[PDB]
Structure 1
Amino acid sequence: KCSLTGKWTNNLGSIMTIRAVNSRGEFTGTYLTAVADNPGNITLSPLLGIQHKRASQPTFGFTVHWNFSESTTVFTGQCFIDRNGKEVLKTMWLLRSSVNDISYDWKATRVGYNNFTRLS
């Protein structure tokens, strides 16, 4: 079975740490991003999400509230287990920027992907 609890890094070098997953599948953690709009401002930021519980290869989502900007990112994906027992999180994300008013809303959402593997 795949539990998101533990430390993970992604293909861009970001690191996240996820705490205990409760019986609802909820989890909290922290996220240290390797990249940002203004990288000189990067600080460790909180995340909160939910994974499925029964499935051996659960889907999940989480939100990262960046502590150094007005933006928010959400990730969703699935945890896969190899024939050798290795775990990979395949994710896609949306990064929402803050804009001044609704006339700028069209430009406020970036999309991307990330693969994560366990630190140790």
Structure 2
Amino acid sequence: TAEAGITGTWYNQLGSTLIVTAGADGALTGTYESAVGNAEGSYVLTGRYDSAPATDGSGTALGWTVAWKNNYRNAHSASTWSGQYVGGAEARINTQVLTTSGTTEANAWKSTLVGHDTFTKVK
């Protein structure tokens, strides 16, 4: 469904790679490899998607998180992508992304970045 459409490899506009499996009951699981930031190698990704989307031409809502810790790096931060999958010949996952770093309370006002990421099936 959107299950078949979402499962697989996606590439963002910055050169990052998402490899994700969409489970039949709403789970997203896989890995992320970032082309930017204090990051190297792959990181675990987990999220959710609407496993019964509308059929009226609407996208399929989804989101996921990556905490930026693996065996090679820990940036003490985590990003969440919120967006929708749009299927078909030019499939895309269009997202907004929040990246929060751990901070002191005094620096909490500057703890969270906002950005946007568009993923496509080809590099």
Question: If the length of structure 2 is used for normalisation, what is the TM-score?
Answer: 0.83
CA distance in 2, matches of 1:89, 1:2: 11
5+ residue gaps, structure 2: none
2:44 is matched with which residue? 46
Secondary structure of 2:2's aligned partner: coil
1:78 pairs, out of 73, 84, 95, with 84
2:95 is matched with which residue? 91
1:29-40 correspondence runs (5 A): 29-36=30-37, 38=38
2:118 pairs, out of 108, 115, 119, with 115
Letter in 2 for 1:75: W
Identity of matched residues, % = 30
Letter in 1 for 2:28: F
CA distance in 1, matches of 2:19, 2:77: 20
Secondary structure of 2:52's aligned partner: coil
5+ residue gaps, structure 1: none
Aligned length: 113
Secondary structure of 2:93's aligned partner: strand
Aligned-residue RMSD, C-alpha: 1.7
Letter in 1 for 2:65: T
What is the CA distance between 1:95 and its match in structure 2? 0.5
1:2 is matched with which residue? 2
CA distance in 2, matches of 1:76, 1:54: 17
What is the CA distance between 1:97 and its match in structure 2? 0.8
Contact 1:2-1:87 within 8 A present in 2 as well: no
